Structure 1
Amino acid sequence: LTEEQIAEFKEAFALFDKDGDGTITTKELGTVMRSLGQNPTEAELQDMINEVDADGNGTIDFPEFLSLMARKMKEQDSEEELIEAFKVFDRDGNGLISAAELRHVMTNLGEKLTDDEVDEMIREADIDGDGHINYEEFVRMMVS
């Protein structure tokens, strides 16, 4: 949108575009993944380009990288938000929300819930049947 934001995205496009032609190819994408210790085969390189390549020419140009980056940054916010919210519920930092933790946070939000009502709410969200809410079960409830 602003000139500074465009500048910063051009700098990120530039580490992927190794030869400076304005396009990122499966081989340039590959050179980047290899430098980060991952060595993909030409097949999953192709799947990665296909996701971002909107005109079908087999490469990625700057408009197409800009759309990807922008969409990816809205998604990464939605995650940051859901991780923060889970972490306020998991008072002891063990990865699981228990009935006591949820009840304690609900009373601080203004809602005094009995053990039967809190148990109903855990039972609804619990998929693996341990009577706790893990992160997966939490995001799945934050939609559904």
Structure 2
Amino acid sequence: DEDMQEALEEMVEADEMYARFNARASGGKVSTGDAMILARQLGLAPSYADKQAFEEKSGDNLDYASFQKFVGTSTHPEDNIEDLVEAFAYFDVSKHGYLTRKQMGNILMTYGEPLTTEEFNALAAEYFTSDQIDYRQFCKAMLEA
């Protein structure tokens, strides 16, 4: 409730947050889905678990203060390169450092919070150039702010 808030202040600048919120705010409130989009646009990476827990306890329409709380809960300060890379390296039987395009697609569209074929196809148009993919390189791209 405070490390989320400390992390918010060192991860987003409040001027930008307020500006975006009022960009899409209709009478000082935004939907939870638009809050997901705004949080992404502020540089955070909320999950759908985050979204559903937050609306489970706070409802579906957020005023600025509840939006601030939601963005706080999406800061995930514990994110780091080595953990994402170990996620992918789980499927890299030899840990040599490469996955194929078919592996990347199946992993991303089968486990966790699967991507839609559209999400994955956009991702792949950008990053899955080859058929052999250096997933540590890809994870660092994904983690750039």
Same fold (TM over 0.5): no
Structure with greater contact order relative to length (CA < 8 Å, sep ≥ 6): 2
TM-score if structure 2 supplies the norm length? 0.35
Look at both structures and tell me which one has the larger radius of gyration over its CA atoms. 1
